[PDB]
Amino acid sequence: SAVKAARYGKDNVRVYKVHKDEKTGVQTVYEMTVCVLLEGEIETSYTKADNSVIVATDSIKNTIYITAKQNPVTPPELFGSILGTHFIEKYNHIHAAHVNIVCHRWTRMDIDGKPHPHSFIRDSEEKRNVQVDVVEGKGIDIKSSLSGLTVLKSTNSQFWGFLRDEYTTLKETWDRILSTDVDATWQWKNFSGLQEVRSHVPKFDATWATAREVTLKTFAEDNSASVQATMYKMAEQILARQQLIETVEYSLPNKHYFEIDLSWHKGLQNTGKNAEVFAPQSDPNGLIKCTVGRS
Amino acid sequence: SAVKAARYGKDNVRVYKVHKDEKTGVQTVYEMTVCVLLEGEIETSYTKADNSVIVATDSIKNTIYITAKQNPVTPPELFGSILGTHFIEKYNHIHAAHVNIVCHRWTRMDIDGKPHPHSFIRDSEEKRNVQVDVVEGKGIDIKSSLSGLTVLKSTNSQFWGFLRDEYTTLKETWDRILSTDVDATWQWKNFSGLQEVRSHVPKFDATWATAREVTLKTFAEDNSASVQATMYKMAEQILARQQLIETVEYSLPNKHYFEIDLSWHKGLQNTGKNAEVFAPQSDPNGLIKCTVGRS
Amino acid sequence: SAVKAARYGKDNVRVYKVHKDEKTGVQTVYEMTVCVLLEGEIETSYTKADNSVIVATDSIKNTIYITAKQNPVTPPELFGSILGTHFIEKYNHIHAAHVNIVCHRWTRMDIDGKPHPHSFIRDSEEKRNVQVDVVEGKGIDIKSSLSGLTVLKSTNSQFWGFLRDEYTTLKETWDRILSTDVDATWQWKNFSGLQEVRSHVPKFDATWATAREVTLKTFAEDNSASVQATMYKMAEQILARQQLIETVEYSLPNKHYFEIDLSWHKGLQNTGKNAEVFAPQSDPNGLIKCTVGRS
Amino acid sequence: SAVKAARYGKDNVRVYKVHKDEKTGVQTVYEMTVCVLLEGEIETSYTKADNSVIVATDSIKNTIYITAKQNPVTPPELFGSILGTHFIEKYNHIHAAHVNIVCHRWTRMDIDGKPHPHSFIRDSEEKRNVQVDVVEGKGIDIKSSLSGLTVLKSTNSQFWGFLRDEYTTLKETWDRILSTDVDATWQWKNFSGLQEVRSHVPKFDATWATAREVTLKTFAEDNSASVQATMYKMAEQILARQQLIETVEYSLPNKHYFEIDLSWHKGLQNTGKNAEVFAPQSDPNGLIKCTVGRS
Numbered sequence A, B, C, D: 001s002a003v004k005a006a007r008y009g010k011d012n013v014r015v016y017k018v019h020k021d022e023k024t025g026v027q028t029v030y031e032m033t034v035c036v037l038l039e040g041e042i043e044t045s046y047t048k049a050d051n052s053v054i055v056a057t058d059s060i061k062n063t064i065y066i067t068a069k070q071n072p073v074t075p076p077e078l079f080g081s082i083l084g085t086h087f088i089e090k091y092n093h094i095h096a097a098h099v100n101i102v103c104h105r106w107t108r109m110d111i112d113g114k115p116h117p118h119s120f121i122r123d124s125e126e127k128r129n130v131q132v133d134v135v136e137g138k139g140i141d142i143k144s145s146l147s148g149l150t151v152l153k154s155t156n157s158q159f160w161g162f163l164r165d166e167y168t169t170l171k172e173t174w175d176r177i178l179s180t181d182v183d184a185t186w187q188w189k190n191f192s193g194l195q196e197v198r199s200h201v202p203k204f205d206a207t208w209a210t211a212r213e214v215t216l217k218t219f220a221e222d223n224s225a226s227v228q229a230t231m232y233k234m235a236e237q238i239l240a241r242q243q244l245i246e247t248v249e250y251s252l253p254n255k256h257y258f259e260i261d262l263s264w265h266k267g268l269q270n271t272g273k274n275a276e277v278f279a280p281q282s283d284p285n286g287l288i289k290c291t292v293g294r295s
Ligand SMILES: O=c1[nH]c(=O)c2[nH]c(=O)[nH]c2[nH]1
Pocket: A159, A170, A225, A226, A227, A228, A254, A286, D008, D054, D055, D056, D057, D058, D059
């Protein structure tokens, strides 16, 4: 037998960092969950019980904390690039580092219409994520995403005109509920190394903001023909607004809300134009994906 | 043997309702999870396989939907009272109904600074809950709560002056992080029946708003001596502002954030006044509770 | 305002203990999750920011580990009694201790038909739990339970003869699937203190075994008239077999499996006697409870 | 813009099937969760709001149930191949089908040492999974796996001889606890179509059994030098025993159990050879992966 691929590291490393402006007294917090997996000339650890080539995963953990202490942790695209570059530059035999970061929300509280200097609220489970692959001699590949953005619109969603055969029972409709959990990923052009990532630092936060804004506005305003059509509209607008992204990927469940026929009870009308009470379905769910690039 | 207590019903009933203003075109959605358990003269179902006394839990499910169709579902204190009263009035042998409702957030989206007429976002997993007990000949007992409100403050939390013995290793501190998940419950005076609940309907939403506001403001502004002291301050202010509540109950975990000593690495200073990077701890956690009433 | 009730402590304390027989070399492991909440003369911590009366929850955590080091951790009824008694005897002003323990399964592996001396498997998420309340001057109250025991029977479950009115759509049936998650609690007679708990130590493991055996055998062999009737049969047999228990409590969901009508497709027969493929329903679910004591 | 990739379908489709031997009366149940995603000439659904090319995901759901009614659902490698082949043969414009199946455990109960004819227990959350990719003109690719197999050994695990630099604090050890959640995947040689999958049907269950047996025996008996070395041993034995598998992939977390130093309390000895009580750590965790193929 032979080792065809191998990677190892530390997962689920929770990190908090605070910044304190001592001249205004305003504090700012950051909280993330980090995973770092390494690749390189490490097969003998597997095949020959040779631990001399292992950078202990405990040491990987320490390195994450030390790196956070000595460098900015925002935007996460930059922090992940710094972290990954460290491993490939420090260890001769380590040739690739894979960094995943999940950013948790801590939004400043407003007290009596004023932003509070050191108090925060978690306003949703939506996450801002990055995947950074640092590969010796091949630069830095970054994928940015938002996930866990849950939305619903109560009307201005349609689904008709689909294929009908002997497996089909679904009725066509011109007015339904649409709800989803948004997972959206934008893939950056390859960067040659950390200097080039630094040169583009302002683009990371602005592109995340744009992706979020485009997603919400398109969802709210599109008289949707299907999930497929709406998500394509989102992707094409993001691409038009940031030339340094190569592709946009959406993964959207269709979280179904079923009409409930009550006419068996005293002739109650609760379907079609009379539909007021619905049954949210936990499973199954549609799952729709697409990757959009430039022609 | 003998049956000492018994209750049965339907759990995890998901319900959506929409309201449509046809003159402005604005839509408003409500989504909840409902549980209904019944008590009464039903022991023979257990002891004698006598199903004639069982209101099927499937029928309980249908009744929830029909009741939502025919009545307002806000505020949840009212809906739960209506639902519970139905069972005890409709079935001679059913003497108590226990209704629990969890309200999920669907907050209207703002698009380009305007509130959107039919699009919504889940801005956090915080819930608004009610527990309504309807007991024949003893009125309606209501407990209202908010839960899942997650907050953090980065400073202006202290913990010193506690008991020190041979089991104690914890250092005193005058500056720490405080983070918690707020669980807060206010218990209403008993109501004689549904007429009296109706008479107080505006008090339910305003009291929820007050409890939320008092919790956030007290958390943000209190230079906290302990979790115990801060939560008492919250409870006493709520009681002072709504005479119809009898008690306020808080249940707060202390979600610990540990300092990380890095001095072993190149003499790095990351403790005390130099603390910038911390390790959020998933477990264990402190758990602090209290029930406050009027003297 | 006034403090009407208060308790505080440490939750989610994970503990492992190993026992090593150095003469046979066999090792035995135990793993649990522990919560300890205290009550007593502690109101001034809440009302007056007086921390002098607080036994720090960090110290409670240390005490759990020290107690596990110095005493047996099985059966959990004994360990919890020891732990709770410690707090009320050591601290004059602490008058009640509430201990909850969740026991996780580590079952010895059999390798080539031989029990392995130091290797274990988690064979299910079923838990063995205890709730121990130690109250100064009122002894020791213990509730033992098993939870997370998930079972299914494919036939020999019925449900007919229930109440039918204008809210009822459910069809009667003489052959259905029955599946549940068993939650079963037996409440011991009050014990006067730790000496009396020690005197009964062998009864704790045997009574847990009996409760488990009775539950599985009754579920498997009863031609069930309803969940209500089957659970009563379980409870009465447990009571008959351990005189020192006062009550038995069951809480059972009915996890529904729905028939799927396929006759719209090529006349396929998949209902009633022809039912082969079913749709497991995640929600809603029936919930059935009862407490049985002795006449 | 242009669509670079697209797939869509139904997720989280829960399915139960029963088999009844009417001559012995023994029943056998199967329960799974199924996902089916399709690819093909469907871009116009995204770009042009052309729903005529969409096989509705609701119809995909119906097809899963109908297919389960008309065909064996074991072994899952066969069922998934049948299901995927259906879509590419039935729809001219659908060229790839991706089927994922999760098999849930329902193990027959033994009552009084006899296997019960229709009663089952869920003995762990371990799953048996398959991923089947059916691609028009390129056959059938199958990946089989077991996941959620949680084990612990209390000794005969070591970790020393690793790289030590200024990021390293971890002590070497010759005796530690090792615990993991096993995720193991074996990739079958490509099959030309459904006829060839049928010809190998007995190999699927036997290879799953072998992979499970090899994993448990190797874990139990290996005096482990590291997670890396132990997992390689497992992979190489599986490859040696089934010539039709091309690669074996393991993904193993190292779920850490920390020693607790108690010497600060009355000189208690609980480290090294005296270690009896340990602290299970929920996070972070090591993560170790490798893919093994044949030289
Ligand atoms: O937007 C949708 N797309 C689909 O492909 C689909 N299929 C289905 O059943 N409902 C929907 N809705």
